[PDB]
Write a protein that binds this ligand. Structure first.
Ligand SMILES: Nc1nc2c(ncn2[C@@H]2O[C@H](COP(=O)(O)O)[C@@H](O)[C@H]2O)c(=O)[nH]1
Ligand SMILES: [Mg+2]
Ligand SMILES: [Mg+2]
Ligand SMILES: [Mg+2]
Ligand SMILES: [Mg+2]
Ligand SMILES: [Mg+2]
Ligand SMILES: [Mg+2]
Ligand SMILES: [Mg+2]
Ligand SMILES: [Mg+2]
Ligand SMILES: [Mg+2]
Ligand SMILES: [Mg+2]
Ligand SMILES: [Mg+2]
Ligand SMILES: [Mg+2]
Ligand SMILES: [Mg+2]
Ligand SMILES: [Mg+2]
Ligand SMILES: [Mg+2]
Ligand SMILES: [Mg+2]
Ligand SMILES: [Mg+2]
Ligand SMILES: [Mg+2]
Ligand SMILES: [Mg+2]
Ligand SMILES: [Mg+2]
Ligand SMILES: [Mg+2]
Ligand SMILES: [Mg+2]
Ligand SMILES: [Mg+2]
Ligand SMILES: [Mg+2]
Ligand SMILES: [Mg+2]
Ligand SMILES: [Mg+2]
Ligand SMILES: [Mg+2]
Ligand SMILES: [Mg+2]
Ligand SMILES: [Mg+2]
Ligand SMILES: [Mg+2]
Ligand SMILES: [Mg+2]
Ligand SMILES: [Mg+2]
Ligand SMILES: [Mg+2]
Ligand SMILES: [Mg+2]
Ligand SMILES: [Mg+2]
Ligand SMILES: [Mg+2]
Ligand SMILES: [Mg+2]
Ligand SMILES: [Mg+2]
Ligand SMILES: [Mg+2]
Ligand SMILES: [Mg+2]
Ligand SMILES: [Mg+2]
Ligand SMILES: [Mg+2]
Ligand SMILES: [Mg+2]
Ligand SMILES: [Mg+2]
Ligand SMILES: [Mg+2]
Ligand SMILES: [Mg+2]
Ligand SMILES: [Mg+2]
Ligand SMILES: [Mg+2]
Ligand SMILES: [Mg+2]
Ligand SMILES: [Mg+2]
Ligand SMILES: [Mg+2]
Ligand SMILES: [Mg+2]
Ligand SMILES: [Mg+2]
Ligand SMILES: [Mg+2]
Ligand SMILES: [Mg+2]
Ligand SMILES: [Mg+2]
Ligand SMILES: [Mg+2]
Ligand SMILES: [Mg+2]
Ligand SMILES: [Mg+2]
Ligand SMILES: [Mg+2]
Ligand SMILES: [Mg+2]
Ligand SMILES: [Mg+2]
Ligand SMILES: [Mg+2]
Ligand SMILES: [Mg+2]
Ligand SMILES: [Mg+2]
Ligand SMILES: [Mg+2]
Ligand SMILES: [Mg+2]
Ligand SMILES: [Mg+2]
Ligand SMILES: [Mg+2]
Ligand SMILES: [Mg+2]
Ligand SMILES: [Mg+2]
Ligand SMILES: [Mg+2]
Ligand SMILES: [Mg+2]
Ligand SMILES: [Mg+2]
Ligand SMILES: [Mg+2]
Ligand SMILES: [Mg+2]
Ligand SMILES: [Mg+2]
Ligand SMILES: [Mg+2]
Ligand SMILES: [Mg+2]
Ligand SMILES: [Mg+2]
Ligand SMILES: [Mg+2]
Ligand SMILES: [Mg+2]
Ligand SMILES: [Mg+2]
Ligand SMILES: [Mg+2]
Ligand SMILES: [Mg+2]
Ligand SMILES: [Mg+2]
Ligand SMILES: [Mg+2]
Ligand SMILES: [Mg+2]
Ligand SMILES: [Mg+2]
Ligand SMILES: [Mg+2]
Ligand SMILES: [Mg+2]
Ligand SMILES: [Mg+2]
Ligand SMILES: [Mg+2]
Ligand SMILES: [Mg+2]
Ligand SMILES: [Mg+2]
Ligand SMILES: [Mg+2]
Ligand SMILES: [Mg+2]
Ligand SMILES: [Mg+2]
Ligand SMILES: [Mg+2]
Ligand SMILES: [Mg+2]
Ligand SMILES: [Mg+2]
Ligand SMILES: [Mg+2]
Ligand SMILES: [Mg+2]
Ligand SMILES: [Mg+2]
Ligand SMILES: [Mg+2]
Ligand SMILES: [Mg+2]
Ligand SMILES: [Mg+2]
Ligand SMILES: [Mg+2]
Ligand SMILES: [Mg+2]
Ligand SMILES: [Mg+2]
Ligand SMILES: [Mg+2]
Ligand SMILES: [Mg+2]
Ligand SMILES: [Mg+2]
Ligand SMILES: [Mg+2]
Ligand SMILES: [Mg+2]
Ligand SMILES: [Mg+2]
Ligand SMILES: [Mg+2]
Ligand SMILES: [Mg+2]
Ligand SMILES: [Mg+2]
Ligand SMILES: [Mg+2]
Ligand SMILES: [Mg+2]
Ligand SMILES: [Mg+2]
Ligand SMILES: [Mg+2]
Ligand SMILES: [Mg+2]
Ligand SMILES: [Mg+2]
Ligand SMILES: [Mg+2]
Ligand SMILES: [Mg+2]
Ligand SMILES: [Mg+2]
Ligand SMILES: [Mg+2]
Ligand SMILES: [Mg+2]
Ligand SMILES: [Mg+2]
Ligand SMILES: [Zn+2]
Lengths: 153, 110, 61
RNA sequence: ACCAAAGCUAGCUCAACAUACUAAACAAAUACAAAAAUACACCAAAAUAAAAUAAAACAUUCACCUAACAUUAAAGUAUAGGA
RNA sequence: ACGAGCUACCCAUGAGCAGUUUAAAAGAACCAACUCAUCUAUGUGGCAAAAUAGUGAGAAGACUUGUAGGUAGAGGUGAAAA
RNA sequence: AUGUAUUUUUAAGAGAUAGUCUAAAAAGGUACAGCUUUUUAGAAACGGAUACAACCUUGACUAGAGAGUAAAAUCUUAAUACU
RNA sequence: AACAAACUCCUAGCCCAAUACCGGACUAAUCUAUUGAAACAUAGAAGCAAUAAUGUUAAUAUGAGUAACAAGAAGCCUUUCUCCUCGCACACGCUUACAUCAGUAACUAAUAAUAUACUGAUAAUUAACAACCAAUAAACCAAAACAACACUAAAACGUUUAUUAAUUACAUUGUUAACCCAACACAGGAGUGCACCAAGGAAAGAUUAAAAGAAGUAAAAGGAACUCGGCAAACACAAACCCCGCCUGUUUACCAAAAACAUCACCUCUAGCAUUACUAGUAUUAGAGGCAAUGCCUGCCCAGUGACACCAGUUUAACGGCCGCGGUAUUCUGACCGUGCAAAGGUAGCAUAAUCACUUGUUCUCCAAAUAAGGACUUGUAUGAAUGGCCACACGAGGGUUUUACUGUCUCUUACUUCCAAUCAGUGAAAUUAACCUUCCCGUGAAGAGGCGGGAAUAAAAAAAUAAGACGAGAAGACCCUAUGGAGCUUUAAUU
RNA sequence: CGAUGUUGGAUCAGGACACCCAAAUGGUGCAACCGCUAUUAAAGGUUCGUUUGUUCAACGAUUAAAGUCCUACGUGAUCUGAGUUCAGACCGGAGCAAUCCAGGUCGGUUUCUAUCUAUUAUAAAUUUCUCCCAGUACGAAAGGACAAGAGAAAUGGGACCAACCUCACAAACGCGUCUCAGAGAUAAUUAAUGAUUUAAUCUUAACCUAAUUAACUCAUAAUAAAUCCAGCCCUAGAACAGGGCACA
């Protein structure tokens, strides 16, 4: 019975799971885009979302200061977090990270792998799944429906 | 416990040829509109992702060559440009990476 | 109880004779009182006297 | 259709003859803890064969059982045997 | 015939026992290294043809242990468990 | 006597000598055993007693897509008024 | 009536069942002598025919793609983060498994990546550390333990003098390693000097978070009510009463660590002595033994069997034994007596015991309840005094009984993690197996049926669990009996 | 005997009735309550502790009751090992000794990865205790009812976290909370009507009869709209399945 559980079991326990997530978060903050197992990236998504929120509280906030000190193992990333990631995420509310499932690892384990990336980074854009153009048959019929609806009012 | 009798080939075939054990056909297979290679509808294209990953690896190698130390991370934003490009007014004041390769078609200025 | 292996394990060879003393008309009254006095440890509260045998291996013995 | 199956050869065995019987190689080192050139010693020795078995047990007995006299008969005879 | 390189006991040559209470190096006391293996749980074709974890006893002595040698089966050796 | 052809010796011989039930005559036990010990007879179907070792019918070869028979298939009552 | 056989007729025949044993006629496949040469005939020979020996060898199947095994994360590609701490060298031992380059389709890593563990080629360990590195006579009792000076158990470790010791660079050998013994790259076994990290490494291949299992943490009220036992666990880790052994210690490597053995102490016996034990010792000694410190003691007996005495006689701290029958004081008993046999007739002590059965002997304390425990009574007619009897301090992973404290032992379990478990990828065993197209009930039957009989049930295949059955698997029952089968041990067995 | 693993317990229990209670009755030396026997009825239960390895047995407190058996005197490929049933060691006895004990004491390895059969949740309650009935009927008084109706609980079935408690996850869990039923039918046993046997007689004589146990069936309750299923969540789940993805 695992009803109402949000945290999946990783590593050698709760503390090892926290340490693994901390290492993943440090790597994500340092490189602005990392890849891991799908479950690990899925769990790290929320922590990365909350880290930007904490950084948006300001540099002088002691709680956010100690949170960054604990999480960002490499101490040169804390100034980066508070002066690059936080300032560039100001008008955005919760659209800080993007997660996409990549093909399985070429190793024999054939793990389900995902890539997480902070938006607005200085990296080549991933092959995002783009929707069809409005000039398609179905979308053009839908545009006709929309035009009729607009003309009806 | 030990088996009582040897299981015949009829039983063995009926056991290990059941549709539950057979590999199911995947009907989410599609071709990538960009490169024409095969990909799944919910999974990013392997070819394009490999291109992006190699470009990212080269960019990161250059930006780490810029920083001679392990704990020397930029405190400002970063911008990468290719041969034949100049930083704009909105791109100045940031750390700059310069590449000898020309700008790829998929990589947009922005 | 005792060492007899499977024999003692699964053979009913312990004998027990239990009978009421007050209504036992086959024993004289003074004798009944004397037994009730001297062997009160072997008599329970319902007046039933109990004797048991375990020594012999045979049930009839 | 996989897994597979089939070759005829290497060679062995039993005898006979036979010179007469520990093959070849032995440059160096070889019983120092072998293949280790080189210092005052010790070197050496012999004393019955036994039993597993048979006698339906087992005590006396039980051929052959790592000692030349071979073959045809005498003869499985005289004898020796808890006879 | 071959076996004391494991083990039982000796023979030469060496090496170990930190800290604490004690006039004590007292076949004393607590507890380490170290040596044994009381109890339980796993293990039972296992890590292992006798182990792991927890927990236990001794821990300056009739103590452990390294090297070399000896006692060989009708026997050796044995603080007798045949 | 009669109906049948078997019996006795001669010369080679091996197996077996660790057995069950039924009917009958007895003994022991408990006038008990799918009990044990003696004597007479029988059996050990591919049919019957639903299944079945011993109970019954049956002088056991082969082919038939012929026939006649044998032992054998639901066993009996369930009843007591006397004003 | 009918239906109903290995019975009997009908139509043709090659014209009557069978275990052990017995007889006969043929015959499969080889070699040889003659025929034959699209593979046969007559004769003579045998290594002359396999559905069966828990048969031997080789390959294969079921169990089974099951149990089981591994690589910390990100990355700019070997750089940074998260954790645990058996590391360096020498001795012994293994021999190149060490280093560089190149390759891994396959072979080795229990899987990949690649490579200290596979393949090929080329190089290497350079002595000052270590091995080999004087004899012959004489002076020499006086410990090592910071050694001042002492104890008993009396203690390895050295110089000087005198005679000869080739005399003259550079000799020979071990120098790698991730390693040794355990069938394995095994959670095991391994001596010594240093420090507890300044050196070594990674518990997780990736997911989900079913049952059951192992490990850990926490728990309302109760606080041993669970159980053979307070085994395990616990915020406690204390005080006591008995049995057995005085105590430290040793023992059945691999089911028994003890109440067993040994032990200081006490007793016996056997020896008046010299060059290998005893012993380089001499009865206050040395062996063969018993019982166990200490305290109270060890009562009777040489009738039997041993030993000295070669016969008498002595020995029990030698092997061992220490009584009946009947009546009696005033009722229970018997101080006492008569008689008989003995070598003496069981003394002291203790006592329902670790002590045959009766036994849960009787009684008191402990508990609400006790075949438990302790204290008393005691013929125990089978207790008993060095095969030792009684108490006592200390002691004991020995065996029993209580008082609190303690707690998931339990009332009555629950929650969460890790290893497990299920899914994906890789590698991939074992016992077992006559063939199974492998149901339930009743009856039957070599006397407990999935296979028979009479009835019910019945699309076929997976995956995960529980173990009622397959008289389940494992070991030609270790209990019992037989074998004119063994072996150990003891003798009053028989030959010696 | 080329193995059918052997006592007590832990867990789970299947069945028989020769019934302990619970239910319906008959006779009583049954006035009433306690009682003693006899018939029918097996859907459900049949306690907690001390001593003993104990089955038994003795005792304490209760209960409506602490039933008798079969089941390899059930169940060790589920468990326990205290005793029995190996090898060690004592005490008493036998044997000169080795050894012997249904004579006692301590200690003493309990293996299995499931091949096949089999199986892996629909319900439609039960029983005690209090108030009246009533100190009423019944009785010389002491004593003392049945039935009917109101409630409290306990067991068991099925469920759930508003609060308490376990609880450092949003959940799970009990020690916490909610619910639990109508009709027919009968066995034993009572009377109406009525012949054989013009009386009577409940009838293996008919007709309709009425009071009637437990079971057992049935009303009733649950599921009960087929072919979209890539991906993402789930109070749904081993895998497979199942419910959601328009508000926001
Ligand atoms: N002594 C003996 N034994 C026989 C006889 N017949 C058959 N047997 C035995 O019976 C057994 C076989 O039974 P059957 O096959 O005869 O039914 C075998 O032990 C066989 O020796 C006979 O006539 N005499
Ligand atoms: Mg007993
Ligand atoms: Mg015994
Ligand atoms: Mg016995
Ligand atoms: Mg019996
Ligand atoms: Mg013989
Ligand atoms: Mg013979
Ligand atoms: Mg013999
Ligand atoms: Mg001979
Ligand atoms: Mg003569
Ligand atoms: Mg030696
Ligand atoms: Mg040695
Ligand atoms: Mg010390
Ligand atoms: Mg000490
Ligand atoms: Mg251990
Ligand atoms: Mg623990
Ligand atoms: Mg200690
Ligand atoms: Mg001590
Ligand atoms: Mg001998
Ligand atoms: Mg000997
Ligand atoms: Mg002994
Ligand atoms: Mg012995
Ligand atoms: Mg004959
Ligand atoms: Mg015979
Ligand atoms: Mg018979
Ligand atoms: Mg006959
Ligand atoms: Mg038949
Ligand atoms: Mg006939
Ligand atoms: Mg016919
Ligand atoms: Mg004819
Ligand atoms: Mg015929
Ligand atoms: Mg021929
Ligand atoms: Mg042959
Ligand atoms: Mg063959
Ligand atoms: Mg064979
Ligand atoms: Mg396979
Ligand atoms: Mg399986
Ligand atoms: Mg597994
Ligand atoms: Mg790992
Ligand atoms: Mg080697
Ligand atoms: Mg490989
Ligand atoms: Mg190599
Ligand atoms: Mg080195
Ligand atoms: Mg995991
Ligand atoms: Mg793993
Ligand atoms: Mg679990
Ligand atoms: Mg647990
Ligand atoms: Mg705890
Ligand atoms: Mg609690
Ligand atoms: Mg108790
Ligand atoms: Mg109890
Ligand atoms: Mg404990
Ligand atoms: Mg304690
Ligand atoms: Mg305590
Ligand atoms: Mg006692
Ligand atoms: Mg002791
Ligand atoms: Mg002392
Ligand atoms: Mg010893
Ligand atoms: Mg030992
Ligand atoms: Mg042992
Ligand atoms: Mg011990
Ligand atoms: Mg032990
Ligand atoms: Mg002793
Ligand atoms: Mg004295
Ligand atoms: Mg003494
Ligand atoms: Mg004496
Ligand atoms: Mg004498
Ligand atoms: Mg004399
Ligand atoms: Mg006394
Ligand atoms: Mg005493
Ligand atoms: Mg005493
Ligand atoms: Mg006694
Ligand atoms: Mg006891
Ligand atoms: Mg107790
Ligand atoms: Mg007592
Ligand atoms: Mg006592
Ligand atoms: Mg005596
Ligand atoms: Mg004695
Ligand atoms: Mg004596
Ligand atoms: Mg003794
Ligand atoms: Mg001890
Ligand atoms: Mg003690
Ligand atoms: Mg000790
Ligand atoms: Mg909880
Ligand atoms: Mg797999
Ligand atoms: Mg086999
Ligand atoms: Mg079938
Ligand atoms: Mg048959
Ligand atoms: Mg049979
Ligand atoms: Mg049957
Ligand atoms: Mg059938
Ligand atoms: Mg049938
Ligand atoms: Mg029927
Ligand atoms: Mg089963
Ligand atoms: Mg069968
Ligand atoms: Mg079996
Ligand atoms: Mg046998
Ligand atoms: Mg046995
Ligand atoms: Mg025997
Ligand atoms: Mg015989
Ligand atoms: Mg013999
Ligand atoms: Mg013999
Ligand atoms: Mg004699
Ligand atoms: Mg048997
Ligand atoms: Mg068998
Ligand atoms: Mg068998
Ligand atoms: Mg069985
Ligand atoms: Mg039941
Ligand atoms: Mg009845
Ligand atoms: Mg009743
Ligand atoms: Mg019942
Ligand atoms: Mg049995
Ligand atoms: Mg019986
Ligand atoms: Mg029976
Ligand atoms: Mg049983
Ligand atoms: Mg049992
Ligand atoms: Mg088991
Ligand atoms: Mg079983
Ligand atoms: Mg035991
Ligand atoms: Mg004693
Ligand atoms: Mg005994
Ligand atoms: Mg015992
Ligand atoms: Mg013990
Ligand atoms: Mg299965
Ligand atoms: Mg299982
Ligand atoms: Mg009154
Ligand atoms: Mg009432
Ligand atoms: Mg309830
Ligand atoms: Mg009338
Ligand atoms: Mg009337
Ligand atoms: Mg219905
Ligand atoms: Mg759906
Ligand atoms: Zn593409």
């Amino acid at each position: 019975i695992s009803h109402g559980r949000v945290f999946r079991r990783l590593g050698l326990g709760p503390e090892s799971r926290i340490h693994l997530l901390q290492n993943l978060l440090t790597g994500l903050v340092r490189h602005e885009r990392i890849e891991a197992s799908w479950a690990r990236v899925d769990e790290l998504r929320g922590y990365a979302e909350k880290l930007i929120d904490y950084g948006k509280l300001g540099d002088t906030n002691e709680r956010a200061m100690r949170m960054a000190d604990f999480w960002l193992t490499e101490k040169d990333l804390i100034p980066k977090l508070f002066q690059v990631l936080a300032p560039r995420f100001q008008g955005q509310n919760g659209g800080y990270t993007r997660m996409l499932q990549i093909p399985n690892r070429n190793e024999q384990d054939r793990a389900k792998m995902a890539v997480i990336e902070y938006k607005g980074n200085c990296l080549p854009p991933l092959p995002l799944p783009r929707r069809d153009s409005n000039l398609t048959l179905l979308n053009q019929l839908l545009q006709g429906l929309r035009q009729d609806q607009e003309a009806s009012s | 416990a030990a088996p009582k009798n040897r299981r015949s080939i009829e039983v063995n075939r009926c056991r290990r040829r059941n549709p539950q054990k057979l590999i199911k056909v995947k009907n989410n297979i599609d071709v990538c509109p960009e490169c024409g290679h095969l990909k799944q509808k919910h999974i990013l294209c392997g070819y394009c992702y490999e291109k992006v990953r190699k470009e990212t690896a080269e960019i990161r190698r250059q930006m780490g060559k810029q920083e001679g130390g392990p704990f020397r991370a930029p405190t400002t934003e970063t911008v990468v440009l290719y041969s034949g490009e100049t930083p704009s007014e909105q791109d100045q004041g940031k750390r700059i990476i310069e590449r000898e390769r020309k700008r790829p078609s998929w990589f947009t200025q922005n | 109880s005792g060492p007899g292996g499977q024999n003692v394990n699964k053979v009913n060879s312990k004998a027990e004779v239990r009978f009421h003393l007050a209504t036992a008309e086959w024993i004289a009254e003074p004798v009944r009182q004397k037994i009730a006095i001297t062997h009160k440890n072997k008599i329970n509260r319902l007046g039933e006297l109990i004797l048991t045998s375990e020594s012999s291996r045979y049930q009839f013995r």
